[PDB]
DNA sequence: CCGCAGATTTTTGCGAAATCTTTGCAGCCAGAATATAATGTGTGCATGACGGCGAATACCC
């Protein structure tokens, strides 16, 4: 819930290139949950960086 | 008007290949796995008929 803004901001870049924005943010939320399930801080990286690639893939 | 020849009919035989399932192959394809920097924002709003009409809140008397 706290990271939905990242999904919205990322998806609005892809909205100008066709496809509904709402579907994009829903898929990005799916990818965000996938990243959350796989996130760790033992790596030392920022969560936003890790979630960015997941959201882009979704 | 009848028996054989031309034409037509009867019968046995071999090659050919195609099809159905199985096996090996290659292009297609799906999910699973990895850790680059990026979170209150974008956004389309495109816009000058005309008549009828009930529904939905407002407001005077």
Curated annotation (Swiss-Prot):
Which residues lie within the region annotated Sigma-70 factor domain-2?
1-58
Tell me the domain of life.
Bacteria
Cellular compartment(s)? Cytoplasm
Give the residue interval(s) assigned to the motif Interaction with polymerase core subunit RpoC.
23-26
Signal peptide range equals none
Fill in the subunit field for this protein: Interacts transiently with the RNA polymerase catalytic core formed by RpoA, RpoB, RpoC and RpoZ (2 alpha, 1 beta, 1 beta' and 1 omega subunit) to form the RNA polymerase holoenzyme that can initiate transcription. Identified in a complex containing RpoD, the RNA polymerase subunits RpoA, RpoB and RpoZ, CRP and DNA. Interacts with Rsd; this prevents interaction with the RNA polymerase catalytic core and with promoter DNA, and as a consequence, promotes transcription from promoters that require alternative sigma factors.
User: What is recorded about the protein's domains?
Assistant: Contains 4 domains, connected by flexible linkers. In the active conformation, the domains are in an extended conformation, each making extensive interactions with the RNA polymerase catalytic core.
Q: What does this protein do?
A: Sigma factors are initiation factors that promote the attachment of RNA polymerase to specific initiation sites and are then released. This sigma factor is the primary sigma factor during exponential growth. Preferentially transcribes genes associated with fast growth, such as ribosomal operons, other protein-synthesis related genes, rRNA- and tRNA-encoding genes and prfB.
Report the family membership.
Belongs to the sigma-70 factor family. RpoD/SigA subfamily.
What name appears for this protein in its UniProt entry? RNA polymerase sigma factor RpoD
Question: Which stretch of the full sequence is covered here?
Answer: 381 to 438 of 613
């Amino acid at each position: 819930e706290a990271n939905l803004r990242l999904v919205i901001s990322i998806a609005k870049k892809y909205t100008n290139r066709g496809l509904q924005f709402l579907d994009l943010i829903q898929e990005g939320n799916i990818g965000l949950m996938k990243a959350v399930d796989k996130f760790e801080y033992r790596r030392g990286y920022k969560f936003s960086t890790y979630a960015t690639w997941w959201i882009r893939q979704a």
